[PDB]
Amino acid sequence: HMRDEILDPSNLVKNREILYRLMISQLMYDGLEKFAMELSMLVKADQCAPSERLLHVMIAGMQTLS
């Protein structure tokens, strides 16, 4: 489950896989199904559920980096 995912900041390959799943989940949540499915097929992503987790992660991340 995406909710239980614990990051290793040094595994850039795994982190890019996680980012694309978060992007597919965000697109699904916002109703852009065809776009989300086309992206999933191109990057061979694992199954994603609709979620706006990426929006909340972005808000926390930008604050931490500022």
Place this chain on the structure above:
Amino acid sequence: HMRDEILDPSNLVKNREILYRLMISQLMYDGLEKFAMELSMLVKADQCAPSERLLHVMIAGMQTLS
């Protein structure tokens, strides 16, 4: 410039606009130009430059939220 953007966590509409620009920039950086341009046209996004800022924001955000 995306590099100078300062967040208001309470402006969810502006934050979703920022997220989609970060997503378009990430897709461009990773070489997925057609996908990035189709997304930009659907959401009427402001001009984006290729950048992997979203990946670094995600890594910081997930750590802060954990």
